[PDB]
Amino acid sequence: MISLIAALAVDRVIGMENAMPWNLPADLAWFKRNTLDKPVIMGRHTWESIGRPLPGRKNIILSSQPGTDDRVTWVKSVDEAIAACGDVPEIMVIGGGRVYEQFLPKAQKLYLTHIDAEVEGDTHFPDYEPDDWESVFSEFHDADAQNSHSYCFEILERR
Numbered sequence: 001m002i003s004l005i006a007a008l009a010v011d012r013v014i015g016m017e018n019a020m021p022w023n024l025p026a027d028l029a030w031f032k033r034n035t036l037d038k039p040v041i042m043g044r045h046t047w048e049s050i051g052r053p054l055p056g057r058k059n060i061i062l063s064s065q066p067g068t069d070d071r072v073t074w075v076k077s078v079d080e081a082i083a084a085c086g087d088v089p090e091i092m093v094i095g096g097g098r099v100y101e102q103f104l105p106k107a108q109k110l111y112l113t114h115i116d117a118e119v120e121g122d123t124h125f126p127d128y129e130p131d132d133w134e135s136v137f138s139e140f141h142d143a144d145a146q147n148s149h150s151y152c153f154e155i156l157e158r159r
């Protein structure tokens, strides 16, 4: 099973100038909880924006170019990325935009955080067909002293 996990601002914005223009520690805790002890697949731009290996996860990077860091696994196609994960229950795809686009057709689950923030962006989550997905979990949170915006955690499963 393949799952996507992402945080979306208004209009499905997910990034700007290779960074995320918000700080929501609650969402990062959610990200960590849902990805720990699982392989994570990311594109090269996302690897660069993160800047180091994510601990306690097998880090797999998609690049058409040879790898430049042996602390992570480098693969050159979607099929190789999947094979590199082995036989695990759940593979987590952590973006960015181009990688989300390619793995969406294969995904059975989406872990989405909807953030009530208006940000200009240059990267967007794919336009997924809402009829194909069932919402099985949602949990809304108002803003607080640590999290500057309200946000909703949602898990959707392909029908």
Ligand SMILES: NC(=O)c1ccc[n+]([C@@H]2O[C@H](COP(=O)([O-])OP(=O)(O)OC[C@H]3O[C@@H](n4cnc5c(N)ncnc54)[C@H](OP(=O)(O)O)[C@@H]3O)[C@@H](O)[C@H]2O)c1
Residues within 6 Å of the ligand: 005, 006, 007, 008, 013, 014, 015, 016, 017, 018, 019, 020, 042, 043, 044, 045, 046, 047, 049, 062, 063, 064, 065, 075, 076, 077, 078, 094, 095, 096, 097, 098, 099, 100, 102, 123
């Ligand atoms: N809000 C969120 O949940 C979230 C999550 C993740 C990322 N982001 C944001 O998204 C942005 C980065 O996304 P992005 O779309 O620009 O880049 P990306 O998808 O992270 O990486 C794109 C790169 O991945 C490699 N790649 C993708 N598909 C491949 C394939 N099939 N075979 C071989 N290599 C492949 C290529 O690297 P080469 O050029 O080396 O071939 C490509 O240039 C940043 O702003 C980041 O902060 C946001």
Ligand SMILES: Nc1nc(=O)c2nc(CNc3ccc(C(=O)N[C@@H](CCC(=O)O)C(=O)O)cc3)cnc2[nH]1
Residues within 6 Å of the ligand: 005, 006, 007, 020, 027, 028, 029, 030, 031, 032, 046, 049, 050, 054, 055, 094, 095, 112, 113
């Ligand atoms: N829901 C969600 N939120 C995100 O911010 C997010 N970010 C990416 C890619 N960007 C990043 C950037 C930083 C870290 C990170 O530093 N996480 C650490 C710390 C967790 C914490 O602070 O509690 C980790 O161990 O996962 C992860 C992904 C992909 N999917 C996401 N999905």
Ligand SMILES: [Mn+2]
Residues within 6 Å of the ligand: 070
């Ligand atoms: Mn080596």
Ligand SMILES: [Mn+2]
Residues within 6 Å of the ligand: 116, 117, 118, 148, 149, 150
């Ligand atoms: Mn807001």
